[model samples]
Target: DKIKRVFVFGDSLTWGWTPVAPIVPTTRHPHADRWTTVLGENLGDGYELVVDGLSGRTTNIDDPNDPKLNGADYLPAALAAHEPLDLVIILLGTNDTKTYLNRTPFEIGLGAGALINMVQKSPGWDWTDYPPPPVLLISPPPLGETIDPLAAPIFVDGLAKSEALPGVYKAIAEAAGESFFDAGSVVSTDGVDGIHFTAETNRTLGAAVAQKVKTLLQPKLAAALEH
Candidate 1:
């Protein structure tokens, strides 16, 4: 069969933000250092990973500060633009816990469910070559203590809320028949700002996700071969 094509939809954590405290007025990790890059390299061959990561993205809610932060609003077009995908990974929700958003962990998982619904509905008769790709729902790690004064106020109680996400997200994934991975299991949001990852952390997450990807895809590969 052809190479497996995976589409990753996420936020700053997946966007490879530099581990600086202020977040903005910052730079991106070198492409090679990005978790997406690491994932692609580790997947080795017969797989392609396409990333659509934005700095302020939320699972389904709008960030008042910017219009482009809602992942649900952008998902359909993104899927259309990258059809024939073999799989899709969603790694979001960190932004949803921003105090301004006021979302509980269940609410964040609901937002993720909304995005999963969109992905499930994406494939159509016009795209006969592929079914809707299976979704891998990844819950981002809990927020660490915010060290930046300005940023700290925005995430008041966010750590507690974020810490509850993995369980909530796991339930959502089970109910939706999707795969699940907790970024917290292998890495953390321990950057200077405590919302992004250091390069080494990103590298670790990338490798871990790659293994999860293989476990998720290998069975499908075997089934296809049997047919």
Candidate 2:
């Protein structure tokens, strides 16, 4: 009963990608280095992690290239496969800021909120035959000003939208009654590129989420012990 299983859903930021020289997004980080995996190690007291990150994932829109990459389309199955999870950590929205998408932070928050509602309504939400699991909704950090030919245009207009995310996400969390964290507080968008978190930032974020997880788990443990 002490063990907890966490399901994480997001885009490349959650994929543990690093430029790693010649390329921009490479899965070069060791399994242990991914934020979700790092969180697993840090929260070993009673938690394990599963990451479902894609390079071009979006909250509500379907990529004309691949409809399967859409979060809304695949979320139900992901939730079912990870059934009985103790916590669901959602770290998305940055991709929604791309020039091609042109969605505002508030709109991005709505998309994420829609996912939270889906989790709450899932049939497999029965983790302990008690209340459903909690959701940790993260407001991804602000994008930087880098103008790399391959990546810049997508996020060139993202600075303001990204900066406005924390407020919007917080409001989303409030309205939906879910836990939220502004990842920008723990990491900065600098070096390498404007979007990807430096490896160090990824580790920093994992540690912070672990601490938050511990806080969120306390009450659940108490309730589980009581009955």
Candidate 3:
């Protein structure tokens, strides 16, 4: 391949939301500050990171209040829109912990699995010569305490549910024979609203994920060279 293309699908965290108190509106981080951009920078000129992140995206569930919040509902189009991808990364589930969602960690993991399955089976809208891309399932960092009381109740039980994700996600990845990365291992949501990354955190995760990508792609590189 002349240039590797990686698609990142996720929620607010992946969207680079600038965490703020619930009372205040949130904005996106600068282009350079986003982890996806940083991942591309670290991957050098041969790779492109295509990011598709929504504010309240859930893996496979419909949000009672928000239309088009279900990742499953849009992933097919997203995959088609960014065809011939070399890799696909999914980072979501934080919002699934919302009290209103009434989901467990295991259920969230299942949702992630469904998305992975969809990616594997996808035939690009405009079919390409390339095969389906490999997948990397990333467990978002655990949710933290909200400084605002109003926002606190919204994410009730989110802390514990979010904390359990990495393990559940890892198991799911293993069962599916896909790659896995624990975002919580390198960064966290302790800053601002306790649900999003700081600029520094994004930088750190971007660099780390870049490293993981390099590692994951090494075998393919070697095989390509051999052929």
Candidate 4:
């Protein structure tokens, strides 16, 4: 079987987490397995999923002391190291929407745009000199309307940003001329808190992404298969 690699760059939602005990796991809760990994599984023999997820990563990079907590700093290197990538899927922005950051959807979109631009211009990736990989941007699902009381500051902080994130990410994707998925619309209601997706929801989301990838990569996948 022919192999195509999918590189995913984003934050916790893409990383998948296992909630601590006392917090009964729900259908949409984050776990050790995330959608990107599942996506590779669904695609079967022809695909390899590469995930670069950083918990609590945001698009913000203005603060010099900015912990570089977000995955942006690491992206160029990741892209450089992995040359000839087939597809690059970016799912981020949930953290930038936090109230503490005092950022708006537009601002978050700007940050995301900047990151895409960086990837485009990366010295190591001479797409024209080689083959340019397709880039897809997935907007984090809408913030859940209800908060999980036990989740502490995450509940309060994450919800505020989640509410307006979809629009922010949509605008960014549009500006970049990249593919976009409104993950929030598909799995927002399925989340345990307003943020993480339950295991079942992950499967649903994974299927959604697979379908999208099939559409976007149909040409390449077909060519690969033929070869």
Candidate 5:
């Protein structure tokens, strides 16, 4: 069966930022290097992927610098804009582990759950004669040793906190009856920055996730084509 739309929302990793650079918008291979592009190519034609990735994005929480950085705040509008999404993928919570966020991994998952809830409750629920679209919850890759002198304090205990995320996030997905994948399973953080992935790893993540999406969407895709 054919699948039309797949929607993705996440933080900078999904935004295609090249680790640390002199300035922001490090559009290194910006055209086709990101995971989403890889996914699109792997999925091939008859499928349109919608992406809304922003740096410093947090699930169900706010970035102090930008009040609208919270995923929940924009999820509804994005849903409306994309329309008829066959699959929804959400990868977030990395930013929540910062020391100042005062958020535990489990709490961060709760926030993710809340965003998933928003997708479930959105009015733009059109997916091939289906009432609700399928959603995939992806936990971001684990953090590595944050040894950069200036960055350590900002990410103090972040490695431990991030390491603890998969279980809690999987639990969230289980309770919500959603598909789940631990991003760390296939992708590793580039130790240079301890948080971002190299382009090769991004390519790896995209192919890996594309497999999951292909498998997960097949049944629904078949149903859609039948109609």
Candidate 6:
């Protein structure tokens, strides 16, 4: 019970969006059963999981015209609401890749870095003032070709942005001394649109994330046990 909670912040991927149709009622995607839930299962009974994923969040801070940029605006408030967390996982950047945003990999990386800095220097919740929770940066999977004609433009733009993500994300993670997972490496081709994960792929992703979280928490768990 003392371990506290795991706080996750991100976009649709963390929201667990799935395609649904009337004919495939049995195939209906369940709500509130995302990777966070699976991660909670792996963490055992003591730890609580908090998910704050918006459907179309972006990291383009300079895009004053875009509303998704507001995603970054929510972090400080979210951290304030969920203070004293054991860990904070951020999985974002997918929406910024859209053609409307016109962001490059470098820009995306910088925005992510800024977001990390925001959390670290939260006005009311300074890391130095409290026990800093470990931060986990999750790089989203690459965007695939859009199946829906309506989504083609955004997908095309997203693909270009995704292509350049790995290197940027790697750099950010390294600089922050945080753990990172390239979700694209695990489930690149497992999406319905060029962006979201399928059900089976989500499960696989959940397992992968759970494994990494366990690894990250091990040293802390060990130190606690010795007391």
Best by TM-score: 1
What is the lDDT for 26 in model 1? 74
Tell me the RMSD of model 4 versus the true structure.
4.8
lDDT of 3 by residue, 71-167 (tens): 9999988887788899999999989998998999999999999999988888744546668889999998888766456578879888999999999
Candidate 4's residue-wise lDDT over 48-98, tens digit each?
888887767876453333576756678877877776577888888877766
Clashing pairs in 4: 27-198, 28-197, 28-198, 29-198, 141-184, 142-184, 143-162, 144-194
The lDDT of each candidate is: 0.88, 0.80, 0.88, 0.70, 0.81, 0.73
Ranking by TM-score: 1, 3, 2, 5, 6, 4
Candidate 4 is scored at a TM of 0.80
- After aligning candidate 1 to the native by TM-score, how far in Å is the CA of 13 from where it should be? 1.1
Question: Candidate 1 on 1-227: residue-level lDDT in tens?
Answer: 69999999999877888877566667999998899999999998889989999998999998889999999889999998899898999999888888989999999999999999999998545645567889999998888876467677889888998899999999999899999999989887778877788889888998999988988889887457665
Task: Write down the worst ten-residue block by lDDT for model 2.
Answer: 123-132
Report model 2's TM-score to 2 decimal places. 0.89
Q: Is candidate 1 or candidate 6 better by TM-score?
A: 1
What are the TM-scores, per candidate, against the unseen true structure?
0.93, 0.89, 0.92, 0.80, 0.88, 0.84
RMSD of 3: 3.0
Backbone clash count for every predicted candidate, in the order shown:
0, 0, 0, 8, 0, 0
The lDDT, on a scale of 0 to 1, for candidate 5 is: 0.81
lDDT of 6 at 93: 86
- Model 2 CA lDDT for position 113: 91
For each of the candidates, the C-alpha root-mean-square deviation to the true structure, in angstroms, is 3.0, 3.8, 3.0, 4.8, 4.2, 4.3
